[PDB]
Amino acid sequence: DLQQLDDTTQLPLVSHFAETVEGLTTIRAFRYEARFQQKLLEYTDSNNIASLFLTAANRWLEVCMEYIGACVVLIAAATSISNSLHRELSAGLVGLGLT
Amino acid sequence: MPLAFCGTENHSAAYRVDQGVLNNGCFVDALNVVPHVFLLFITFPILFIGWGSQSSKVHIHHSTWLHFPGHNLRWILTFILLFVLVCEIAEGILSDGVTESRHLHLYMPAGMAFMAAITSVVYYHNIETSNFPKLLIALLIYWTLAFITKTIKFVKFYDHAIGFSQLRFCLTGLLVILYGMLLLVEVNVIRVRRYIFFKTPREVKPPEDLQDLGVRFLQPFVNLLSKGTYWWMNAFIKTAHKKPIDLRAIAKLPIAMRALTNYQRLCVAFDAQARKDTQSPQGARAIWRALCHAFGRRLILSSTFRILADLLGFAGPLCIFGIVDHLGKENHVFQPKTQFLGVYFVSSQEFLGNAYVLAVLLFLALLLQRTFLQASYYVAIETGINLRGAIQTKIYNKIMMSTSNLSMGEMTAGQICNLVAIDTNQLMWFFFLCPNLWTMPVQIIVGVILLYYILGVSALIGAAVIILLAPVQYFVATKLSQAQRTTLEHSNERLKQTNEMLRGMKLLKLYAWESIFCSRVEVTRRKEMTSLRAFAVYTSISIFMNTAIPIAAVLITFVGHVSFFKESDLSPSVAFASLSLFHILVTPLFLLSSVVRSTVKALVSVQKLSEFLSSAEIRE
Amino acid sequence: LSSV
Amino acid sequence: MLSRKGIIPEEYVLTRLAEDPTEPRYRTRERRARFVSKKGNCNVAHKNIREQGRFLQDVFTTLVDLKWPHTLLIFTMSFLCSWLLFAMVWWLIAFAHGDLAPGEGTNVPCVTSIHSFSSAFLFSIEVQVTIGFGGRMVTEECPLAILILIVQNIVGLMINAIMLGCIF
Amino acid sequence: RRARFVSKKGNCNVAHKNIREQGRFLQDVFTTLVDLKWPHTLLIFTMSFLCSWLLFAMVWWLIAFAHGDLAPGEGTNVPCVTSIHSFSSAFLFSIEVQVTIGFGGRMVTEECPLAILILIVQNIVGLMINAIMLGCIFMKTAQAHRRAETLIFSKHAVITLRHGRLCFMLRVGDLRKSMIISATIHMQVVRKTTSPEGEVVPLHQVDIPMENGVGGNSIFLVAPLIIYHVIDSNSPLYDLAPSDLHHHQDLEIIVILEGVVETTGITTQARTSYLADEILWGQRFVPIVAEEDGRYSVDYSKFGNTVKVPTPLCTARQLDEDRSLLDA
Amino acid sequence: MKTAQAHRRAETLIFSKHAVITLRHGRLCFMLRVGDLRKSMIISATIHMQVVRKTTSPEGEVVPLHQVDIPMENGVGGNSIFLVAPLIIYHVIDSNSPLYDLAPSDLHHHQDLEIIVILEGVVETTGITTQARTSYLADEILWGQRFVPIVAEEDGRYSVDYSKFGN
Ligand SMILES: CCCCCCCCCCCCCCCCCC(=O)OC[C@H](COP(=O)(O)OC[C@H](N)C(=O)O)OC(=O)CCCCCCCCCCCCCCCCC
Ligand SMILES: CCCCCCCCCCCCCCCCCC(=O)OC[C@H](COP(=O)(O)OC[C@H](N)C(=O)O)OC(=O)CCCCCCCCCCCCCCCCC
Ligand SMILES: CCCCCCCCCCCCCCCCCC(=O)OC[C@H](COP(=O)(O)OC[C@H](N)C(=O)O)OC(=O)CCCCCCCCCCCCCCCCC
Ligand SMILES: CCCCCCCCCCCCCCCCCC(=O)OC[C@H](COP(=O)(O)OC[C@H](N)C(=O)O)OC(=O)CCCCCCCCCCCCCCCCC
Ligand SMILES: COc1ccc(Cl)cc1C(=O)NCCc1ccc(S(=O)(=O)NC(=O)NC2CCCCC2)cc1
Ligand SMILES: Nc1ncnc2c1ncn2[C@@H]1O[C@H](COP(=O)(O)OP(=O)(O)OP(=O)(O)O)[C@@H](O)[C@H]1O
Ligand SMILES: Nc1ncnc2c1ncn2[C@@H]1O[C@H](COP(=O)(O)OP(=O)(O)OP(=O)(O)O)[C@@H](O)[C@H]1O
Ligand SMILES: *[C@@H]1O[C@H](CO)[C@@H](O)[C@H](O)[C@H]1NC(C)=O
Predict the structure, then answer these.
(1) Which residues lie on this side of the membrane: Cytoplasmic (chain F)?
(2) Less CB within 10 Å around the terminal CB: N or C of chain E?
(3) Cα separation of D49 and D66, whole Å?
């Protein structure tokens, strides 16, 4: 959902720029530039918020997935050292696991 | 032979208080237990009342957050004292091993202190979510009480000639400094909000940005630890599973990230520079200084996190080397030499040499890296996105320009639209990869340094092989981008031709001219297909290089060390610390080429943007 | 709903 | 890393155009917002409430409002925290007074038959609940024990009084 | 400067001077104890118990001294109280008896019947004091004056034409989720009114109708509500002029929100005032209750925010004439 | 239930010894002053008023104590009252009030009039409803007098002088 929201939000914005250049004489004629300035800001805000939510969701996954990886490290390290202190894993397989 | 606080040797002679009540090395530990359990037994009723209130009637669903003064440094002190408390637990478990029975006076106070610190940040958060700082008196007495008790412990250690050789002396001294540096934080809250001993409290209202009804991207107004792990995202993500994400369901972004707010900040930088400096034009270098002055205060912060994350990333292979080195040598002794008053003090060298302790430290080091790295990423992205808004607003401001045949005949509306889209996106992407040019050189330099120490000159040969994959990837990627350019600029003509020969479907179908134009398009498709074949070749070399540079480096490394060098026989510790280093060095080496290309394209983009932003205006 |  | 760093370039010549929205029906999504449910339970979610501690200052209205299982937890935890807190004090004053080390016949301990922390905790139970199993008295040897006995009795009676009121 | 009849957050602000005291402020000790602050109640809680413990400790010590059981130390005698060696033991014995601990090492023998009488007196006194302190604590845990502080009255009140009639509005809102049963809203105009007969009343409290749909005072308050009073010929606000609404004006619109808290059952008042300066003319309140996805949503951030609106710049009396003449 | 007694708090409510009858707004009204001594409020303070007389109906009834109710002449017609300072509690003698035939001469000691006054309300410290009763025999009514203003203005706040409460 957020990915589509990103793309479909930056489509009107670039379209807005093209339209504004074509009727630049018309826009400056009406002295009605502030309304299109607000249109830019509204479009820019709608794009930045979608982009920021995509970023924050991506970082959310990365943090959670890396904590699961870190938990793997602790479990693997603890059990492997235990097995190599008693069952004599011979210290080679332990490093091959930790890496 | 039961569980005794001070052990059961010499017929419980550890409990004699004959010489001194506070000179008994086990009684000072008993005293240190008191302030931690005191906090637990005064705050648990309060915390359960709060949890019940959330369940039964959570009236303030969108309750605003009021963070007390000294709130970021509050959390960081708690984090670093949690670290030392884990280390104290590790030292206690490691020192009691040389006794007949578990002493319990080495890791009960530290364990309860660890739980007390966690509960004293939970309690602090519950007193920050709802603005009520009178309940913070319980935390001020707690911190000062703990600072008192271990100060007594610290001075006793110095009398008995402990010194900095024994690790627990260093840990206790450092931890005492921590308690003092956090008691000062508590009295800072007293001084600012004036609630305890001053005539009238100075209340503060929550920031207006959070007070807006619709604001869901509440990232700035969050406690430091939920900024690290993005805990606030959980509720939003869960909602997305049931209800979709509508453009009115997405947040209205905060003031700090509003386009006009960043535009005002950028205008302040421009105006201040162009006034204090007599540089008449606002050219390329002027805009370059403007971006730095406007967003440096956050870009530096991202770089600092990235550098810390890099230095902590090199604590995985190094801890592996330590663990596997300890894991051999038949573990002949495993005994603490130092003896003091019937208790053993584990030396610093005897501490980082153990296996379980090093593994726990490795886990904690990874927890810091995986969060600093993501925190660095987010700051870079947020600065880049704020840059995009400000730069887009600035470009559109100069559009408000003269429609002369010189200007409009040189850069048409298509050109300016492409300028907006392409240039600003790749300038934003420069600000994403910007901390890399400050860190990745440090990463590679420090990686090569400590890889030499682990193995030797053969490791430098392997490092040379990997460091000889950035230029190779650069040439291949440049060729790939040129092939993509040719392929894409050919499919443009094909797509325009297909659109032209499919818009008039009725005319071509009536004249029985549907297949003939289909073949006329297929000819250009075959040409584009040849170009795409070149693109596929140049992208397969990149896949090969990415997934075969490390393996070829490993083969060269070990073969050289055994055959050519014969300096030192291989060991599992050395041979796997170096291999793990190779993985951690392969990840940035490939991406360094893309960083260089992004920097080059950023310079060209600002050249484009400065040739535009200083064009002929309309009038006064 | 249908969207879900 | 499909597009970790290679997504920087933009074609800007895309053929994307208008497409069917296929938006969901608004009637199905929109449901009449009832002010109050059929049986009480006013469905009026509050928002942006400024918290000044008002909800946690009136702790006794909060305690009565909470569900019985939560009240039971607070009931249990209040007693158990006080019991453990004074158990720590009683154990530590004994170990400071040096009465569980010697076993000497001439020394008179300030709290008779303190041998461990379990004995101290049982003595804390007896004092605050007012059972007094007799095997753990208070002698006259240290006046600090008498002061702690006074504090423990008064704290226990205050806690019992408050919990009685909430239950009533 | 200017004298406030009541404070904004209730707190009736009238100083009572020259009261003849018949001892009433201490004759009903139980209402006084409940009024007291919690730290002061704890002090009296501790002092009552400790004085009783120490008083009976003196009695037990003195009876032992008279009976000659602590001085000699000769096992031929049978002490009236077991193992009373010093005053500390007597004080501990008082603790054991009145709290009903009974550590067993200080029993009561049968030797002197005065000890049995004193034991009876001590137990009865301990039970009476425990009963009285329990009652005070139970009436202090049923206090609902902190719940009154969760009733919110808007800082400024506005006046705008509703249904063509110039009405004085007001917003009151609840913070706690638990209802207040039988919420009654009164309203008064504290003013110095002189009658034609020469009377000069300093604070002539005149009640105000609440323009309810049934003419009553009851209100069902969940979301913030507008509490508007319709200014007609029978209202004392019928001669209010906007230029007569500055700070140094003799106006104060007291508001009294009664009601019984359902969580405990104790009737509570919420009080506020509105000086003339806090009255705003010709404004209205911004609507609050939105309509979100599932249910209603009340935004308390805009609770007191107001927006302007065109209004007649004349009194209410001059408005009845501006409309009667047009109708005529 | 004995520590929650609120009769001793009702003993702190003060009624003026003698009530007056004096014109207000032309109409002739029976005025009365009620005051509170404690700092705490009395929630929902209601005031009633009755005229105990010996009434003979036209049909032949002779009720020995007929208690006729009396309006309090409130701004909303109700009985509820908010009491911080001493209040004036005046009843306007209209054509419907049983005091519509009072005379100064007929208001001596040997007259069968009594004006019960029932102040009610729920104390806030305990939440228990109370009453405060008083009566005014025909000798304890003073025709043609007005009470002295009592709520003087202090610098900081309003100051009430209880010394002149009954003057
Ligand atoms: C000099 C004489 C005056 C003495 C007191 C003055 C203040 C003392 C400050 C130090 C107290 C120690 C830390 C306690 C933290 C809470 C203190 C406190 O006051 O509670 C805060 C809150 C409620 O506050 P409020 O009503 O919003 O404002 C207070 C009001 N303005 C006032 O008059 O203030 O409170 C609450 O909402 C209460 C929640 C539950 C409380 C549970 C606390 C348990 C205490 C148990 C003590 C055990 C002791 C055992 C001793 C054994 C050793 C021998
Ligand atoms: C070798 C060093 C490591 C030592 C170990 C202990 C932990 C780290 C301590 C050292 C440094 C800590 C951070 C200090 C950096 C200074 C700035 C800081 O605190 O926040 C840095 C940033 C942003 O902050 P901001 O200014 O509020 O930003 C928004 C701002 N208000 C605005 O208006 O725009 O903040 C962010 O952008 C959010 C992310 C912050 C970083 C994550 C916090 C820690 C999470 C780690 C979780 C687990 C750690 C293990 C702890 C227990 C170990 C047993
Ligand atoms: C026929 C004449 C009338 C009856 C005379 C009785 C003769 C009694 C002789 C022995 C008295 C013992 C000394 C106790 C001190 C106070 C005694 C006493 O009578 O106080 C008097 C008052 C009780 O109301 P009142 O003013 O009498 O009421 C009359 C009327 N209704 C009025 O309006 O006026 O008291 C109060 O208004 C209460 C104030 C605070 C009370 C606090 C309790 C004190 C004892 C606490 C005990 C401490 C622990 C030790 C216990 C040891 C027990 C052995
Ligand atoms: C033997 C040594 C002493 C042993 C003490 C026993 C301690 C046991 C645990 C505590 C039991 C009692 C906790 C009650 C907390 C009540 C909280 C509550 O009701 O709302 C928060 C309170 C209420 O505000 P207030 O304005 O102060 O009083 C109410 C108002 N004035 C009224 O009319 O109702 O506002 C507040 O401020 C919070 C209440 C006070 C917070 C903690 C109380 C203890 C403070 C320290 C004082 C100790 C004094 C002892 C000295 C003895 C010397 C001989
Ligand atoms: C995966 O990173 C790296 C790994 C290792 C190294 Cl040595 C460097 C990097 C790196 O490149 N550091 C630059 C900072 C960076 C770059 C990419 C990413 S990301 O994961 O691709 N996330 C997104 O692009 N989100 C987009 C942003 C644009 C709008 C739409 C959402 C996140 C952060
Ligand atoms: N969101 C809210 N939550 C709780 N109480 C509120 C809230 N908003 C206002 N109040 C309370 O309402 C009263 C003032 O309301 P109002 O909005 O009319 O004024 P204000 O300008 O916001 O006041 P102040 O600056 O005193 O908070 C105060 O008692 C204030 O504490
Ligand atoms: N300052 C005061 N403080 C307390 N009660 C008062 C005060 N002034 C009058 N009262 C009470 O009011 C009643 C009589 O009031 P009033 O002033 O009308 O008569 P009085 O002649 O002053 O009375 P007396 O001298 O008998 O008390 C009595 O119940 C009296 O106790
Ligand atoms: C305690 O025990 C050890 C080992 O039995 C002994 O060396 C030491 O001297 C003892 N301490 C004494 C007896 O004080």
Answers:
(1) 1-167
(2) C
(3) 21
User: Which two three-digit tokens encode residue E5?
Assistant: 């009849």
To what resolution in angstroms was this structure determined? Answer: 3.6
Indicate yes or no: CB of D81 within 8 angstroms of CB of B49. no
Class of the domain covering E26-145: mainly alpha
Q: Return d(Cα E161, Cα E284) in angstroms, integer.
A: 9
Crossing angle (nearest 10°) for helices B72-95 and B167-193: 160
Backbone breaks in chain E after residues (C–N over 2.5 Å): none
Residue located nearest, by CA, to atom 2 of ligand 6: D50
- Rounded to whole angstroms, what are the CA distances from B448 to B456, B466, B558? 10, 11, 16
Alpha carbon distance E97, E53 (integer Å): 9
Which residue pairs from A35-40 have beta carbons closer than 8 angstroms and sit at least 24 positions apart in sequence?
Answer: A37/B396, A37/B400, A40/A13, A40/A16, A40/B259, A40/B392, A40/B393, A40/B396
Q: What is the length of chain F?
A: 167
Which residue do the tokens 């009851």 mark?
E218
As a whole number of angstroms, the distance between CA B22 and CA B31 comes to 9
The answer to whether residues E247 and E322 touch, using CB atoms and an 8 Å cutoff, is no
Q: Render the burial of B238-254: b for 16+ CB within 10 Å, e for the rest.
A: eeeeeeebeeebbbbbb
| D130 annotated to a ligand binding site | yes
Asked whether A58 and A66 are in contact (CB, 8 A), the reply is no
* E178 contact residues in B (CB cutoff 8 A): 57
Token digits for B582? 């190779």
| CB distance B277 to B413 below 8 Å | no
Q: Which strand (E) or helix (H) includes residue B340?
A: strand B339-340
Q: Which ligand is nearest to the CA of F34?
A: 7
Q: What single string gives the DSSP state of each residue in B555-572?
A: HHHHHIIIIII-SS---H
Structure determined via? cryo-EM
Question: E284 CB contacts (<8 Å, ≥6 apart)?
Answer: E158, E160, E169, E306, E307, E308, E309
Residues 6+ apart with CB under 8 A from F38: E24, E25, F9, F12
- Round to whole Å and give the CA distance between E313 and E315: 7
- The answer to whether residues B346 and B96 touch, using CB atoms and an 8 Å cutoff, is no
Distance from CA of D82 to the nearest CA of C (A): 52
* Distance of alpha carbon B115 from alpha carbon B123, whole angstroms: 12
What is the C-alpha to C-alpha distance for residues B543 and B554, in angstroms, rounded to an integer? 18
Phi/psi at E316 (nearest 5 deg)? -75, -35
Question: Closest Cα to residue D43, out of A51, E297, B206?
Answer: E297
Burial of A34 (0-12, 13-18, 19+ CB in 10 A): exposed
Round to whole Å and give the CA distance between D54 and D52: 5
**Distance from the alpha carbon of residue A58 to the mean position of ligand 5, in angstroms:** 9
